[PDB]
């Protein structure tokens, strides 16, 4: 009663339970190990997957057949307007784990970030932080806020900033309620970290101050939801012969007689998609900052003046008007989903990681139908 012929198991037991994620925003489940000699930097952002397109670039990779040749590659655009830092949180090492010691918020919080604390903003009184705000206008109150900073400097082993997105600057997102997270400050001492975070309250962080060009980043987020799915698509098992009574799309035997139970290893039907995932080593091909030539889609080889947004806009997204980021390959989530960009935990040393990218062409033809023009005036002047 050994199986006659062997084949590897279908599906991975390492991503169980394959249930709906408990989170819409992706959760950073580990930050890069700290290096106190580095200056105080941040380690993550919240972006919005806008869409995909493709480049054509030319390779430099001696020994590869692609050397001195062209290549076409899919890329994903993530719109990443500046983050706004509203708070600071300190952590202390305890025998059970890490613990929040205290936290200080900024005086002025926008309506967007304050929407985060309500489940019906409109019919509330909008009182959140209306009394914590008064701590900034009395010398006894200022004394506390300053004293809380001293306590973080005195005992913290880890410092994080609270930041929210400027959700209002993406009109294609019909959202006013900003997304809020904690982003760890690496480098410098705890005294350096607290000064770096508080000094920079109520202000904006571009994506440039954290991520660079040609560096490898992890992308975190929740995958597309597909509802309740059977075993053939959910797990990838083979179909049964055509002439089976009661259906093809199942697993024929779900276990032996003993143990007299169904094991957790057998494939079952259930939720497919909307799962948390961390995806590593997505390379950065281009940083687009509003107000410089690096924002538009004009290379050194192609000078046709055009914007990154394809004709007719990114489908189901809108128009990318702010800072954005160009990643090699595909991105977790549907369009409009908030994604967590995180600095790599690993050391990047391989030749792919160090490789320098020079684009030659960015396709801005329409992603509806078979796009055939790169700009609208190209289209208009073609016809009439």
């Amino acid at each position: 009663s050994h199986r006659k012929f062997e084949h590897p198991r279908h599906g991975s037991l390492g991503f169980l339970p394959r249930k709906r994620c408990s989170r819409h925003r992706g959760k950073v489940k580990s930050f890069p190990k700290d290096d106190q000699q580095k200056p105080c930097h941040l380690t993550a952002f919240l972006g919005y997957k806008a869409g995909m397109t493709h480049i054509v670039r030319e390779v430099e990779k001696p020994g590869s057949k692609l050397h001195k040749k062209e290549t076409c590659e899919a890329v994903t655009i993530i719109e990443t307007p500046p983050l706004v830092i509203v708070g600071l949180v300190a952590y202390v090492k305890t025998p059970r784990g890490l613990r929040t010691l205290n936290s200080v918020w900024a005086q002025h919080l926008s309506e967007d970030v304050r929407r985060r604390f309500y489940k019906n903003w409109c019919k509330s009184k909008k009182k959140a932080f209306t009394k914590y705000a008064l701590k900034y206008d009395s010398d006894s109150g200022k004394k506390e806020i300053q004293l809380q900073l001293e306590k973080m400097k005195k005992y913290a082993t880890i410092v994080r900033v609270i930041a929210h997105t400027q959700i209002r600057k993406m009109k294609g997102l019909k959202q006013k309620k900003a997304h809020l997270m904690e982003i760890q400050i690496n480098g410098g001492t705890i005294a350096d970290k607290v000064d770096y975070g508080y000094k920079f309250f109520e202000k904006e962080v571009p994506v440039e101050a954290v991520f660079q060009k040609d560096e490898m980043v992890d992308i975190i987020g929740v995958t597309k939801g597909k509802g309740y799915e059977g075993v053939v698509t959910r797990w990838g098992v083979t179909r049964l012969p055509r002439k089976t009574h009661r259906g093809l799309r199942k697993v024929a035997c779900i276990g032996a007689w003993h143990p007299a139970r169904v094991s957790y290893t057998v494939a079952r039907a259930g939720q497919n998609g909307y799962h948390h995932r961390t995806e590593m080593n997505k390379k950065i091909y281009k940083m687009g900052k509003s107000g410089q030539e690096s924002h538009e889609a004009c290379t050194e080889f192609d000078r046709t003046e055009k914007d990154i947004t394809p004709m007719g806009g990114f489908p189901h997204y809108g128009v990318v008007k702010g800072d954005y980021l160009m990643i090699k390959g595909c991105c977790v989530g549907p369009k409009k989903r908030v994604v967590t960009l995180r600095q790599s935990l690993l050391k990047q040393t391989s030749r792919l990681a160090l490789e320098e990218i020079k684009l030659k062409f960015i396709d801005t033809s329409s992603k509806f139908g078979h796009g055939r023009f790169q700009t609208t005036d190209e289209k208009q002047k073609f016809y009439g």
């Binding site: 493709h54 480049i55 054509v56 062209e70 076409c72 080889f301 192609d302 046709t304 030659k360 062409f361 396709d363 033809s365 078979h370 055939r372 790169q374």
Partner: protein, 61 residues
Amino acid sequence: LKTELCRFSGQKIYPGKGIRFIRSDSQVFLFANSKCKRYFHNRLKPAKLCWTAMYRKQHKK
């Protein structure tokens, strides 16, 4: 930039796109999209299809 032309419909083909057919006589046909490709293999004549580049020069449109 280095554009390329559709053998059927006579439109510009931009980098990273197109379908390249090789016929037995070693003649290379490059199509812009699958609409052109299926009409070609159905043996339509791009001079009889109103939206083609060959048709428009033939009727001075």
